[PDB]
Curated annotation (Swiss-Prot):
Changing R287Q: In NS4; likely benign; one patient with Noonan syndrome also carries a likely causative mutation in RAF1; the mutant protein does not affect phosphorylation of the RAS effector MAPK3/ERK1. Transmembrane segments: none annotated. It comes from Homo sapiens. Keywords: Disease variant, Guanine-nucleotide releasing factor, Phosphoprotein. Expressed in gingival tissues. GO terms for molecular function: epidermal growth factor receptor binding; GTPase activator activity; guanyl-nucleotide exchange factor activity; molecular condensate scaffold activity; protein heterodimerization activity; protein kinase binding; SH3 domain binding. Residues 3-193 form the DH domain. GO terms for biological process: axon guidance; B cell homeostasis; B cell receptor signaling pathway; blood vessel morphogenesis; cardiac atrium morphogenesis; cytokine-mediated signaling pathway; epidermal growth factor receptor signaling pathway; eyelid development in camera-type eye. It is linked to Fibromatosis, gingival, 1: A form of hereditary gingival fibromatosis, a rare condition characterized by a slow, progressive overgrowth of the gingiva. The excess gingival tissue can cover part of or the entire crown, and can result in diastemas, teeth displacement, or retention of primary or impacted teeth. GINGF1 is usually transmitted as an autosomal dominant trait, although sporadic cases are common. Interacts (via C-terminus) with GRB2 (via SH3 domain). Forms a complex with phosphorylated MUC1 and GRB2 (via its SH3 domains). Interacts with phosphorylated LAT2. Interacts with NCK1 and NCK2. Part of a complex consisting of ABI1, EPS8 and SOS1. The keyword Glycoprotein does not apply. This is Son of sevenless homolog 1.
Length: 340
């Protein structure tokens, strides 16, 4: 249902957002490691960010060519012919950096080595000195952002196929076929790397308000306005333990609300009473700080602290470090949404 031109328009918007993400990664997250030569060697940086810089250069070059092509496209053509933009680059093996990148970032021991780099002497303190939120963003959000190049390059393979099938110009079609061919090595190479179980789980990990109303409907004792009257999207739904509370609360995370409920699944109700599976306990408005907490003999491990306006802090605990990571990823992203 999409024309060749729609795909190109969609792609230009995608690569512009992507380029912005690469910039964020380079100027905001990576620059501080590069700046502290004493704490991180060239390799340390290399082991975390890989070919990120080359990929950024390739991307700006790709978008630039595509932009000129479009502007220089007269009414004589059925659609701008971008086949050549891709073919010229693929012929110079310009996409090779992505295979190397994917290999470095999706290696099985990536995260462990990443953490060791953040926990070695003076590292955590240096990251905190960069500014509020940097240490948390680096630890729980950066590893997700670092996957962006993989998603982006994988989509290229699919994009080129669709363009080839939809091209209305024989010369353009030919260029596309050639680009596809010249990229077969990079593709099978990335394919092997991405199909391994761990990588596959990681990629899957970071991959109509009917749901919002369906969720409120199933929550008893609602307070304040509707979910739709302050939220625009649904982020997460998991389980956590409130340090101090008696029962593990089920939680619905929206961009505007973190709803903490109690599960009454299967428990008896009086006739005429609500049949909703959950009971509202805490309704938190997302527009305040989020702090990380170290494990405590207090039985609470994999915990973090939420700080509300003029309210008392609340501490939650997750079932594992993996669960805590998913929550901090979403929560930290929400707190610094303006930057991210």
């Amino acid at each position: 249902e999409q024309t060749y031109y729609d795909l190109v328009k969609a792609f230009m918007a995608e690569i512009r957002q992507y380029i912005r993400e690469l910039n964020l990664i380079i100027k905001v997250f990576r620059e501080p490691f590069v700046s502290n030569s004493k704490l991180f060697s060239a390799n340390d940086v290399e082991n975390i960010f890989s070919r990120i810089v080359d990929i950024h250069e390739l991307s700006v070059k790709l978008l630039g060519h595509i932009e000129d092509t479009v502007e220089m496209t007269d009414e004589g053509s059925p659609h701008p012919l971008v086949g050549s933009c891709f073919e010229d680059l693929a012929e110079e093996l310009a996409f090779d950096p992505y295979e190397s990148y994917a290999r470095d970032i999706l290696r099985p021991g990536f995260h462990d080595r990443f953490l060791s780099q953040l926990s070695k002497p003076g590292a955590a303190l240096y990251l905190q000195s960069i500014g509020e939120g940097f240490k948390e963003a680096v630890q729980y959000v950066l590893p997700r952002l670092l996957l962006a190049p993989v998603y982006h390059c994988l989509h290229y393979f699919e994009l080129l196929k669709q363009l080839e099938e939809k091209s209305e110009d024989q010369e353009d079609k030919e260029c596309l076929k050639q680009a596809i061919t010249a990229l077969l090595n990079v593709q099978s190479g990335m394919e092997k790397i991405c199909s391994k179980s761990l990588a596959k789980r990681r990629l899957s990990e970071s991959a109509a308000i009917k749901k919002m109303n369906e969720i409120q409907k199933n929550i008893d004792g609602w307070e304040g306005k509707d979910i739709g009257q302050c939220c625009n999207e649904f982020i997460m739904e998991g389980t956590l333990t409130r340090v101090g509370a008696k029962h593990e609360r089920h939680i619905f995370l929206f961009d505007g609300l973190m709803i903490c409920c109690k599960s009454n699944h299967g428990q008896p109700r009086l006739p005429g009473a609500s049949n909703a599976e959950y009971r509202l306990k805490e309704k938190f408005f997302m527009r305040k700080v989020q702090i990380n907490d170290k494990d405590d003999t207090n039985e609470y491990k994999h915990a973090f602290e939420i700080i509300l306006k003029d309210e008392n802090s609340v501490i939650f605990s997750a079932k594992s470090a993996e669960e805590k990571n998913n929550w901090m990823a979403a929560l930290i992203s929400l707190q610094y949404r303006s930057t991210l």
